[PDB]
Amino acid sequence: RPIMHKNWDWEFVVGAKAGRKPAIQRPKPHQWYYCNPKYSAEDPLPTKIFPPHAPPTAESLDDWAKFRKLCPKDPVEAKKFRKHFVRFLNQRNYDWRTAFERGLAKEVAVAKAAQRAEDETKRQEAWHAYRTAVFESAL
Amino acid sequence: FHTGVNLVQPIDTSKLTRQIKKLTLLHEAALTVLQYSNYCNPEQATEILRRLPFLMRHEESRVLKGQTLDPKLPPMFHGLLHVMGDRFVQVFSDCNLRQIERGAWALAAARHQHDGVALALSEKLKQLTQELLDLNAKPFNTRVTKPTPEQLNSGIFASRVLVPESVNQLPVKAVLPEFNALAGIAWALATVAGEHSAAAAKAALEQLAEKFGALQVDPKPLPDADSLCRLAWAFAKAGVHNPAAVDKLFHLAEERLKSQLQAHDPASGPLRPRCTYRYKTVRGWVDQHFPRKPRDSSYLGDTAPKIIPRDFEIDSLGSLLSAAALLRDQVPVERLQTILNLAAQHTAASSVAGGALQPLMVTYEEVTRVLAACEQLGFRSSTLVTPLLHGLPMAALSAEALSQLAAAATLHHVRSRTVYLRIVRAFNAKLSVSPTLVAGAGIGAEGKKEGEAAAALGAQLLLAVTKAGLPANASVSRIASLV
Amino acid sequence: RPALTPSFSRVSDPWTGEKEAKYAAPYRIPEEVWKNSGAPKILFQDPWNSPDYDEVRKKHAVLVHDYLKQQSQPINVQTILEGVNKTHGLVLGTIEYVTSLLENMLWHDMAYVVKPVFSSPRKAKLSKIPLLYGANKYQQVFRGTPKEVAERYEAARAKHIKVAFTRLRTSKTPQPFRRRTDEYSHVQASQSALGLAAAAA
Amino acid sequence: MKRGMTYQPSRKKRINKHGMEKRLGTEDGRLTILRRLEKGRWRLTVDMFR
Amino acid sequence: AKRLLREAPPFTEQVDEKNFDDKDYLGAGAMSNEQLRKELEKVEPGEAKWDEESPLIPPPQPRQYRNKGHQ
RNA sequence: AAUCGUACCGCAAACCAACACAGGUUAGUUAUUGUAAAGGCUGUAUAAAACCAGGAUAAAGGAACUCGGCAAAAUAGGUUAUGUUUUCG
Numbered sequence A: 001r002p003i004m005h006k007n008w009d010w011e012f013v014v015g016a017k018a019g020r021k022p023a024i025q026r027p028k029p030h031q032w033y034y035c036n037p038k039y040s041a042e043d044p045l046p047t048k049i050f051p052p053h054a055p056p057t058a059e060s061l062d063d064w065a066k067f068r069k070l071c072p073k074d075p076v077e078a079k080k081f082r083k084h085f086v087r088f089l090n091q092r093n094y095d096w097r098t099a100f101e102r103g104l105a106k107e108v109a110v111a112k113a114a115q116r117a118e119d120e121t122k123r124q125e126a127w128h129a130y131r132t133a134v135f136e137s138a139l
Numbered sequence B: 001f002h003t004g005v006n007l008v009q010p011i012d013t014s015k016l017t018r019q020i021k022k023l024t025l026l027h028e029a030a031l032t033v034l035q036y037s038n039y040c041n042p043e044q045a046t047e048i049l050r051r052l053p054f055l056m057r058h059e060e061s062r063v064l065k066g067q068t069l070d071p072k073l074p075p076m077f078h079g080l081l082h083v084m085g086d087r088f089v090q091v092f093s094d095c096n097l098r099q100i101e102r103g104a105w106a107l108a109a110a111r112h113q114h115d116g117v118a119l120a121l122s123e124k125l126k127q128l129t130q131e132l133l134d135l136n137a138k139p140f141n142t143r144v145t146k147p148t149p150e151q152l153n154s155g156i157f158a159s160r161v162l163v164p165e166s167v168n169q170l171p172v173k174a175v176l177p178e179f180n181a182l183a184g185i186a187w188a189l190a191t192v193a194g195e196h197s198a199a200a201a202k203a204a205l206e207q208l209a210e211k212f213g214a215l216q217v218d219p220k221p222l223p224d225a226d227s228l229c230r231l232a233w234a235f236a237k238a239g240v241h242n243p244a245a246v247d248k249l250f251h252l253a254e255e256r257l258k259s260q261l262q263a264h265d266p267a268s269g270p271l272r273p274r275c276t277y278r279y280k281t282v283r284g285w286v287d288q289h290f291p292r293k294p295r296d297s298s299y300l301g302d303t304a305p306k307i308i309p310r311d312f313e314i315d316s317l318g319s320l321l322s323a324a325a326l327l328r329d330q331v332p333v334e335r336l337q338t339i340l341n342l343a344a345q346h347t348a349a350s351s352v353a354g355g356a357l358q359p360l361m362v363t364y365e366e367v368t369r370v371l372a373a374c375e376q377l378g379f380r381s382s383t384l385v386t387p388l389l390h391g392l393p394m395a396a397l398s399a400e401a402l403s404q405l406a407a408a409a410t411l412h413h414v415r416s417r418t419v420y421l422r423i424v425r426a427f428n429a430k431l432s433v434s435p436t437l438v439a440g441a442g443i444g445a446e447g448k449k450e451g452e453a454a455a456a457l458g459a460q461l462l463l464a465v466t467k468a469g470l471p472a473n474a475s476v477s478r479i480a481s482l483v
Numbered sequence C: 001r002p003a004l005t006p007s008f009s010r011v012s013d014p015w016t017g018e019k020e021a022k023y024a025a026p027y028r029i030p031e032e033v034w035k036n037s038g039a040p041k042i043l044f045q046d047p048w049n050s051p052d053y054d055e056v057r058k059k060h061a062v063l064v065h066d067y068l069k070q071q072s073q074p075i076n077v078q079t080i081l082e083g084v085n086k087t088h089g090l091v092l093g094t095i096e097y098v099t100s101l102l103e104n105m106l107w108h109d110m111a112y113v114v115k116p117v118f119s120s121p122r123k124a125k126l127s128k129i130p131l132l133y134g135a136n137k138y139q140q141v142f143r144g145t146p147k148e149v150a151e152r153y154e155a156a157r158a159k160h161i162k163v164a165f166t167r168l169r170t171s172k173t174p175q176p177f178r179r180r181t182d183e184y185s186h187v188q189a190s191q192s193a194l195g196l197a198a199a200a201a
Numbered sequence D: 001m002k003r004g005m006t007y008q009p010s011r012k013k014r015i016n017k018h019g020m021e022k023r024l025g026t027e028d029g030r031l032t033i034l035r036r037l038e039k040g041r042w043r044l045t046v047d048m049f050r
Numbered sequence E: 001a002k003r004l005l006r007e008a009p010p011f012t013e014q015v016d017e018k019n020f021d022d023k024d025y026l027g028a029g030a031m032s033n034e035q036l037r038k039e040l041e042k043v044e045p046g047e048a049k050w051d052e053e054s055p056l057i058p059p060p061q062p063r064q065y066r067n068k069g070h071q
Numbered sequence F: 001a002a003u004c005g006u007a008c009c010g011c012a013a014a015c016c017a018a019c020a021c022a023g024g025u026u027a028g029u030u031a032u033u034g035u036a037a038a039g040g041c042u043g044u045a046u047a048a049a050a051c052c053a054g055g056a057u058a059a060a061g062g063a064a065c066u067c068g069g070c071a072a073a074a075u076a077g078g079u080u081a082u083g084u085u086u087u088c089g
């Protein structure tokens, strides 16, 4: 079994394409796997739950092993300690999405600006050729 | 004031500082380095260099039990050092003494050779040699209130928050207060020196050796054991020939070892080194000579001290003695013998509490490093080896290592039945049958030994035991029968 | 690739304060011949901006900034214009354009200006003596010349110590705390690989 | 102040205050159940479901 | 909120800065096996006695951590 | 290793107010120097009445207004040699 899933339909992830379960509009972390349009029953199930936005460097994380070492011995403090650890894990899923959305926005803006420069260059070159023809025609 | 589009710099200084302090992976470091390496001031450029050696070790430890390190990382680690090395040279003229220490150490620690840095360090070492070895020299002061125009070029004061600084009262009667700073820089110059910068590095070090030898005073706080080792290896690597300087350096090491033993009372407990205990404070950090009690803070999550050793330890004795073997010809025999005896006394006293033996844990790498120096120096002593064997675990060692250890103990005339039994018992449990004897692998050696190789290891162990004179036991009898 | 004005005396600068076009006809003609003839003006000059309008402006600022770093004393805008043109050639046309670049540097603390001392506000307003500009080797967080920056830092340092101990006395943390937000996702990992490929190439 | 918000729903409160287990715990509650059986109401308690 | 009353628990990546080894040592040019055999044979079989040891010897004690002064 | 929750709304046109109600509704997180990344949202067709509501400007005078400086306006901030009163803070 792999640790992370690698085959995602990126049109579905960004939002241009509908999912395999259109009734679900905002998948949960454990619902992403079965909402993927490229779902297959032959692929082995990953051993951990990650969203499509997670980086490939998360395969070396072991969070519950560290939690046990930090476990307080007083049950009253232990319950609150565990509650904050679960809060930390859930928030980490939505930090990845925010970074994912900001990172893609910068790449899109760069590409759009580059196209704008090329279009103006072609228009100016075409006009210059037309201007030259006018002078040549008039001798 | 810093709102809008900056036509000169792509990233604001304050934001760049935030990213540097927020680094935990090499990929994140590569993202920052490959984009804004040309806009870092000396404070930012040197901070990245110090972190990189630690980030490389962290990733090697992130690998789980059944995984392996990504092969693309080590090439990237050296790629980032080279890029930062170039920027270090560009801003080298605006660094402080402390900043130069950070940048030089990072490259030397990573064993990355850079001609540009070596040439820059060579000129700096010459300038600092005549200033830091002067008798009328003052310690470096971090309490700056109104910086000079040249201090504004270091980038320390371009901050929107409080700048941490040491709160200690600087000594006013210290001799050569910055000797440790000079020793580290010289060692880095030797290590970072390349093929085209070797001549310049050697010339600068030779002048330092002559100045060091022609000195009639000793620093009031004696140089740390780590600094002494670094300076000794700076001469050894560079090939500097100066018996006067070499002898003086070993004299300081001898003096420090005696002082530690003189001021030790065995009734208190096993010998331990003197260290500097650094704690976090409101305005920065404070250094103490003795530890505090454990404390619970309402705001800090960690109140533990940073321990910076000053006296010698087994780790440093294996590096100082290594340098001595390289520089044997330049050291009088009398001084070498005195240091060797002091080293044995330091080891014996560090693992004894009250009237009973209390072994101190050591690793196999450390033991081999110490023994290798002794073999080169031809020093045989049972008071230095016996403490090392008691504190050495013998559960994960290969069969070959156990055989070598038994031979070493016999040659050093170690007389302890417990040590011999712990070795033969471990060796017997690793010698398996099938009709071919197989010797298991382990930390000590790579691979397994089968057939004659296993028999040879058994014969050597039996020969060592027979010379030692151990009474017959089950473990030895089984080994003899198999071999 | 600087272009000359129709008078063939200077180059046009990329900013909104430039009221002169770029001559672009295939043949060189005096202004008086074609300006009053009645022909369309777009046949002789280009009144628009270049496709690289933003990139050119950034390059010009770096040239001005680097030249100031090489200077050892504050100088006038006229000296800056002559020095840059001599070093690289005819690339800047007016002192007003250089002033606009300097204002951006002043705002972000990449440069500083030395102002005279006047006895009354009205004398200061009516004064016409040119100003002197310098440059910071690295970006700072305080305004003014290096002497002024040092004074401002000293006041700031005292305030920081005052605030930290007041917080401790009133049972607050001496130093504010936050949580570390993870800003490394799959997009960032792919950007790093792209960066290495470009650097290798 | 604006009035008319005297109902603040709570599922645990509703079951504990008017549930079948509560009505069967006292003699008066048992009499209430009989009265509702006599009148022939289809739902006896707010707590009832199939 | 954004403002914490104390340091957050160590749930993020923790980079360790303890016990960093960067010292220089000798090579691995040790003696050959045959040389060791010759040395052992040359050892005189001195009939000495063993030292008087305590009946129970405690196991090795771990060493305390160390840092560097390049802060 | 079984069992129950997992769709959608959740400062709201979906919950409490008879309503697609300018009201009420707990906790956790995020960008931003003088600003502000991500994400989210969107109004039948005109105009040169009186009058009403919420703003802006105003010559000379400056409380003459009125039960009443109601409302509106106003250098509003910081450091002071000296003096007064104190329960001495």
Ligand SMILES: [Mg+2]
Pocket (backbone or CB within 6 Å): A026, A027, A028
């Ligand atoms: Mg949902």
Ligand SMILES: [Mg+2]
Pocket (backbone or CB within 6 Å): F058
């Ligand atoms: Mg008026």
Ligand SMILES: [Mg+2]
Pocket (backbone or CB within 6 Å): none
């Ligand atoms: Mg009146």
